[PDB]
Amino acid sequence: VNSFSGYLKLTDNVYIKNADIVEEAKKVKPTVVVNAANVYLKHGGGVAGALNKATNNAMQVESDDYIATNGPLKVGGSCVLSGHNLAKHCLHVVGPNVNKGEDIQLLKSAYENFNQHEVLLAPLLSAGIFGADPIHSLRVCVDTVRTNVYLAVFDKNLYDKLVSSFL
Numbered sequence: 515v516n517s518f519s520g521y522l523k524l525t526d527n528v529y530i531k532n533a534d535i536v537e538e539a540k541k542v543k544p545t546v547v548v549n550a551a552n553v554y555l556k557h558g559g560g561v562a563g564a565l566n567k568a569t570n571n572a573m574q575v576e577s578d579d580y581i582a583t584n585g586p587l588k589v590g591g592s593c594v595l596s597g598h599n600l601a602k603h604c605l606h607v608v609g610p611n612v613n614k615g616e617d618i619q620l621l622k623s624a625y626e627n628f629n630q631h632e633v634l635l636a637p638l639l640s641a642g643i644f645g646a647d648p649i650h651s652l653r654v655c656v657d658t659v660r661t662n663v664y665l666a667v668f669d670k671n672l673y674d675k676l677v678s679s680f681l
């Protein structure tokens with residue numbers, strides 16, 4: 515039993531809710547919140563900009579030190595950093611950005627990072643400003659993630675389409 519509330523159950527392990535991941539994180543304080551990161555951990559917009567703003571820029575400060583030490587992530591890769599005031603940990607996961615020409619096949623590799631954590635609050639990877647079809651992202655999630663994932667979808671119109679079209 516966990517503290518996630520109001521989710522529709524999609525499969526054995528995947529749950530979905532129309533919710534602002536920032537507000538959801540602040541309420542649940544999950545062990546792991548997933549950020550829709552880029553390889554530079556520059557959290558300017560989309561989910562990343564919103565999560566970072568909610569940390570009063572502490573996420574960005576921590577991220578800049580991480581990059582200065584380790585260099586950029588790989589597309590499809592991840593790193594674990596602090597969750598600040600939102601979660602115990604933040605898993606920064608880089609899905610491919612279609613508006614940069616990156617191979618959509620890397621979306622499965624990106625979701626594989628979720629399997630290293632028993633329970634996660636997450637957005638749909640590569641959705642929103644990353645340019646991929648959120649319906650496809652949900653399919654890859656369900657077919658790749660085996661751990662328990664709670665998906666927060668900001669847009670209500672999108673949430674309804676994802677549910678109604680789910681196979």
Ligand SMILES: Fc1cccc2c1OCCN(c1ncnc3[nH]ccc13)C2
Pocket residue numbers: 533534535536550559560561562564637638639640641642643644666667668669
């Ligand atoms: F860049 C994106 C990368 C991945 C997914 C999404 C992106 O764009 C921003 C809007 N989306 C959100 N989804 C869930 N929680 C959210 N909180 C604020 C925005 C937001 C979808």
